[PDB]
Design a protein around this ligand. Sequence first.
Ligand code: GDP
Ligand code: GDP
Ligand code: MG
Ligand code: MG
Lengths: 165, 161
Amino acid sequence: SWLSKLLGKKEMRILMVGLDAAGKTSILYKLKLGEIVTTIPTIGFNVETVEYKNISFTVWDVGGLWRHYYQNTQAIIFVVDSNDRDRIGEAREELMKMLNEDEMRNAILLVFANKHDLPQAMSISEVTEKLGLQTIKNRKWYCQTSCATNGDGLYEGLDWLADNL
Amino acid sequence: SWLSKLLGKKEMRILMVGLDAAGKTSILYKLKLGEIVTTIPTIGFNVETVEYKNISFTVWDVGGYYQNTQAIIFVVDSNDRDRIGEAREELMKMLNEDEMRNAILLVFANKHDLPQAMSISEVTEKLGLQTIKNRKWYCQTSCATNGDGLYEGLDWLADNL
Ligand SMILES: Nc1nc2c(ncn2[C@@H]2O[C@H](COP(=O)(O)OP(=O)(O)O)[C@@H](O)[C@H]2O)c(=O)[nH]1
Ligand SMILES: Nc1nc2c(ncn2[C@@H]2O[C@H](COP(=O)(O)OP(=O)(O)O)[C@@H](O)[C@H]2O)c(=O)[nH]1
Ligand SMILES: [Mg+2]
Ligand SMILES: [Mg+2]
């Protein structure tokens, strides 16, 4: 479904970021679009890439030069650990910084509220409020619950992304 | 060349482990042997792999694939005094595994560039390396940022297989 709408001749660049241990690597792997490749453009800055035909997913941790990899980004996936209540405030701050990058002003926002399987995970209502998504203007956004370990939610989120480019 | 020595017909499997943040991914990248590939064979277990001709490095974090292993590289953060005991415990666990009794051991005392780093004698001591019998081992200081020490360590590894 989403694969159909994303594939083509023109490069499709997706940025997936979030705090460490949000589940970003696990998501890449569960997509099955090919090998996860790690590069280190500078020491301490680990970048994971999955490239399949015209589609690129670029992943790194935030909250710990970036502007280079923002070129022609069409979507931001922001992954949050729904169970990490102590760092939701940090996640909000890093998301908002991403969102005032002019280079990516026309990128749509998909939020994965990940680790939905966990007994004290925040609800999608809670995650949406605490990330301040309602405050977003002039950008399409969606927040989608996910479990990156069984893959629940991932295709639903990507389907929305593909439909709204 | 440490590379030319490892090269040949016979498979050469190296296992590189250590605590998270020890410097293992940085070391792999510095080796320039090929793309680093991540797999997740089981939930929560991230494995990084570099394969070049007959040589494969397999990397994962311990703390917090043993068949035909010719060498174990253990990477320790020389500047992390609070966790070297945990590094010792995980190293000793691995060296007790039957499947790998025949593997030689290279220890990289990494992050040697940092001004407060433990000296090699102290790393050696706090890892209990001297207590290891019936295994060839070597401790080498390294800096993964600029490659200091890496070639020296790998050359010892290639020589002593
Ligand atoms: N329970 C649960 N654990 C998850 C989920 N997604 C990731 N994890 C675990 O959280 C840890 C961090 O995952 P990882 O993908 O490496 O996060 P990254 O640092 O953002 O790339 C790993 O142990 C994962 O197995 C999830 O949806 N549910
Ligand atoms: N100062 C210094 N920092 C290092 C060295 N090796 C790695 N690092 C840093 O330590 C952190 C963790 O290294 P990484 O390769 O990701 O460790 P891994 O978790 O064992 O794969 C990164 O911020 C690196 O920049 C080193 O030799 N010296
Ligand atoms: Mg990751
Ligand atoms: Mg690593």
